[PDB]
Each structure stands twice: as C-alpha cells, then as structure tokens.
Design a protein around this ligand. Structure first.
Ligand SMILES: [Zn+2]
Ligand SMILES: [Zn+2]
Ligand SMILES: [Zn+2]
Ligand SMILES: [Zn+2]
Ligand SMILES: [Zn+2]
Ligand SMILES: [Zn+2]
Ligand SMILES: [Zn+2]
Ligand SMILES: [Zn+2]
Lengths: 57, 266, 268, 53
C-alpha cells in the first residue's frame, strides 16, 4: 500500500510541474523542480515563488 | 459738595428763612421737605423721634445767634460744667460758681481733638478704599478660576482623545494590513486562474478546430495524435483547485461597548 | 479560427510549399519564420530540441497522399498498432514484421470515437473553469466591499463610543459649572456689604470735611453737632466686617487619572 | 459681660446702616437668632423685609 501511495505522490508532483510549464515556460524544468520542492507544493504559493525569482511580466 | 448745600426733595440752596432742620442721620433739609410722630430721613431711617431734631443753622455770608432764654443776650461763653455754651446771664444765674472757661481755649482744644479723630478715620477709610479694589480683583480672579478649570477639563479630555486615536488607528492599520494581504492573495489567485484559463483556452480552441475539420482530413490528423494526447495530459491534470479564504475578520472587531461606557462614566 | 490557418510572424495562409513545421506546444509556423540548437516558440518556450519538431502537414484540398519516411514513393496508409503511428506496406513487412497491426478504417473510427470522448470530458471540465473564473472575479468584488464595510463598521462604532462619552463628560462639566457659580453667588454678598458700608461712610465723610473747611463765623454752627458727628462716627467707627477667604479647590477637582485612560484605550 | 453688649450693638448699627427702615426691636431679634455672624445677619435681613439696594 505504501508503494502505491508513493507512485501517486510522484504524479501529484509532476502535475504541478506541468502547470509551471504552462505558466512561465522558458525557465528550465530542473529549475522549476527545486522550487516546487521548496514550496512543499502549494498551488498558489508555488506561483508566487515563480513570480519572485525570474522577472516580472 | 454740590449735594450737601442743597436741601432735601427740592435741592434748594440753603435758605435760612426756610427754617431748615438736620436729622440725626446728618442729612439736612427744610421742614418744608418732610412734615409728619417719629420722623424719618429721605435717605436713611426714622433714626429718632422728632424730639431729637435740631434746626440746621447755615446762614452763609448773620454770623450771630442769640441765647435761648435771656432773649437778645447772646451766648459767647463756654459753661465747662455743662458741655455747651451760655450767655453772661446763665453763668451768673444757672451756672453760678460752676467751674468756668472761655470760648477760645475750648474751641482750640476741640478743633485739635476732632482733627485727630478725622485724621485717623481717614486713614481707616483709606484701608476701605484699598480693600474695595482688592476684593473687586478677587472676584474677577475667582471667575477666572472657574473659566480656567473649564478649559483644563476640556484639554485633559482632548489629550486623552489624542492618545486614544493613536492607539486605535494603530490597531486599524492591522485591519488595513490584513485586508490588503488577503486581497494580494486574491489578486494572485485570480491572476493565476485567468492566465491558466487563457492557456487552456488556446489549447482547447486549436484542438477543437483541428478536430471539427474531420471531412477528408483523416490523413493530416492521424499524424499528430501523439502530441495531441500529450498536451491533453497537460490540460488533463492542470492541477489547480479553487480554495476559499473564509471571512473571520467579522469575528475580529472588539466591540465591548458596555465596558467603554462603564469606564467613561466615572 | 482566423488565427490557426495563418502562420507565425507573417500570418500567411497554410502554404504547403512554406515547409510549415509544428512545435511541441502545438503552434505552427514555417521554417522561414524561425531558423535557429534548441528551437523556441514565438509564444511559449523552447519546450524541446529541434529533434522533436515535426513539420505541419496541412495541405488543404491533390495531396490526400503523404509519402513514407523510408520507402520513398510508397505512401503511408496503414497503422502499426504496436508503434502508435502509421507506416506504408513495406515497413510492416520489414521493420514491423508481425508487429501488432491495424488498418486505417477501423483504427480511424475507433480513434475518432476515443479522442471525441477525451475531448468531451475535457470540454465539460473546462466549462467548470470558465465558471470558476467568474466565481473568483465576483469573490474579489464581494471581498473588497466587505473589507471596506468592516473598515467603516469599526470606525463608526468608535465614533458612537466617542459621542456618548463626550455627552457623559460634558454633563459632569456642566455640573461643576453649576456648583461653582452657586458658590460665587453665595460669596457675592460680601461685595454687597462692602459697597453699602462704603456709601454710609462716604456720606458721613463728605459731611465732616465740608464741616471743618467752613470756619468763618461758623464756630457757632459747628459747636452744636459734635455729639452727632461722633455718634455716626461710632456708627462708622465699629463697622464690623472681616474679609473671609474662599479657598481654591478648583485645582483639585480635575480627575487626572490618565494612566487608566491609556490602559483602557490600548485593547480597543 | 459689658463687652458682648457693645459687640452686639456694633452689628445693630451696621444693620441700621444697611437697611434702616426696619425698626430696631425687629433687627435685635434677628442679630440674636443668627448668633451674631457678620454676613449671615445680612442674609437673614435680605430674607424678610426689602432685599434690594
Ligand atoms: Zn425743601
Ligand atoms: Zn439719612
Ligand atoms: Zn453749667
Ligand atoms: Zn442766656
Ligand atoms: Zn510565416
Ligand atoms: Zn506557442
Ligand atoms: Zn510496429
Ligand atoms: Zn514505409
């Protein structure tokens, strides 16, 4: 059961990564990942951090 | 001055023929000013019966007045045993070998004693004339004390209001900061939703057109099912669910109005 | 609609001669719009190397035929089920020898019927977002109106507290005012006393002064009234008033307890 | 006791100075009823009788 929950968690992280790609796409994936881990994967706090380092559009 | 010389109700000049009389209260008026038992003053009281009322003798510019009893024999002499004056006949008659004196010496002595009386009474009426202004200023001073307390209270009130509005608007800035931080979050979230909805709407619009053209296009279409379904996995788990920040700032206004009135009564 | 058929920078109609390629982000543009390692999108990003960039095949209305990658003029018509894509007859004999296999006609029917299911599901999902957009848009207006209204509720409650407090203070002020003017009217009798006494003394005094100053054949007229001059001189000699002093306690009737005021104003 | 008599007579003469129209026997009863305070006597004098300058 714990392995099933882990394989779910993986997709849960990847989906938020895909949203980041839809939003600000030009920054590398290896860059977005360190931040979605930093944020502990909050759907809006991730986006706020994305606005933080990078630029302002 | 202008009022002493004149009479009572008529204010006529001292006419000796007017037989003017002088009251125990020292006013002077002709017995043609007030006629009727005990007689009263035009200013003071019926301070005495008519029996103690002497006619005013003030005959300006008849220097002489003659004795009561011995008719035309005038008084010049001072009967030292009777405190008053007599003519030569009474000092041979009534005051025979009563211890005797002349006018000059007793007149000098009486002037010198009355002048002393007058001087000391004037030195005392001067203390009156000064204590009058003293109490007159003290009255304005007490009225000013009332007014100055009237202002002191209001200014203590207003200083209390000042520091209170400071300590109240400092707490109001908390409502400012919160409301605008929650609104910063709401702006962020609406912005995210709008930009993501537009990316999804572009993806959806293009895919929808590309599919709806399915007449004689199966050749062109079948070449791209891979990347179609790839961006469909992109828009499939797009991963945003609307949270809602509940309103509990309604339960943050400290409205304890009863405590306020209880402490403001005293 | 008007935007898909057209190209990238030039917005040319889909010219098959234009060699239009299709990027991973699904936009389309001719290789004459963007030439340059990893190639990026005019809208999105460099989502993929140029290696994963296929050319757009949209030659509308006699190229219903598209020809295979390897076997030259042998056109792709067949679908390799084991490779998710298409091949011509030859690839299915060589590369896809006995590889699980499907024909276009049945695979196209089944694939259209499955992609339409995926599309209907994603359309019914995106409707909920086209609704939640307006949902949050109105939530902003309601949150801002409620923020302004709570911001005004606090202020108006404070103002009402202040109104009633000023009434209840000004009341005690008027009370002290009534007390003070009562006390002054009571102490006022002393000026009354002083004035009337001064008048009696001034009458007598006027009289005495004139009486002495006239001395020309007035020893007679004068000599008669020494007794009553000294009688009303006993009247004005013991006049009998002593000035009392009303102590000032109006300085110690202001309730200056400010330390309690600040304490009760801190919390609210 | 001959001092207290003059102490009373002084205030009596002062009342005659203030309000003279009132008889003397009347003012005596009041200067006794007040126990001979300088100003309270003037107050009780405004009480009954004329009370205006
Ligand atoms: Zn007259
Ligand atoms: Zn008089
Ligand atoms: Zn004699
Ligand atoms: Zn004679
Ligand atoms: Zn172009
Ligand atoms: Zn693009
Ligand atoms: Zn195959
Ligand atoms: Zn082939």
């Amino acid at each position: 059961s714990e392995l099933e929950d882990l394989s779910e968690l993986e997709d849960l992280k990847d989906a938020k990564l895909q949203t980041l790609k839809e939003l600000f796409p030009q920054r590398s994936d290896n860059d977005l990942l360190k931040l979605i881990e930093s944020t502990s994967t909050m759907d809006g706090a991730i986006a706020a951090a994305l606005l933080m380092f990078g630029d302002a559009g | 001055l202008e009022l002493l010389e004149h009479c009572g109700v008529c204010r006529e000049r001292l006419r000796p023929e007017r037989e003017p009389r002088l009251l125990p209260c020292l006013h002077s008026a002709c017995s043609a000013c007030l006629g009727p038992t005990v007689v009263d003053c035009p200013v003071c009281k019926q301070q005495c019966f008519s029996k103690d009322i002497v006619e005013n003798y003030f005959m300006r510019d008849e220097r002489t007045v003659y004795c009561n009893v011995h008719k035309h024999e005038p008084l010049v002499l001072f009967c030292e045993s009777c405190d008053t004056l007599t003519c030569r006949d009474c000092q041979l008659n009534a005051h025979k070998d009563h211890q005797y004196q002349f006018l000059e010496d007793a007149v000098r002595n009486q002037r010198k004693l009355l002048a002393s009386l007058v001087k000391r009474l004037g030195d005392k009426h001067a203390t009156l004339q000064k204590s009058t202004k003293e109490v007159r200023s003290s009255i304005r001073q007490v009225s000013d004390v009332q007014k100055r307390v009237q202002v002191d209270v209001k200014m203590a009130i207003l200083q209390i209001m000042k520091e209170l509005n400071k300590r109240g608007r400092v707490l109001v800035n908390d409502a400012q900061k919160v409301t605008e931080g929650q609104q910063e979050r709401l702006e962020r979230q609406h912005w995210t939703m709008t930009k993501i909805q537009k990316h999804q709407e572009h993806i959806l619009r293009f895919a929808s057109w590309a599919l709806e053209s399915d007449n004689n296009t199966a050749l062109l279409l079948s070449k791209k099912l891979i990347y179609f379904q790839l961006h469909r996995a992109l828009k499939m788990i797009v991963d945003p669910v609307e949270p809602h920040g509940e309103m509990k700032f309604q339960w943050d206004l400290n409205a304890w109005t009863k405590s306020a009135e209880a402490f403001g009564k005293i």
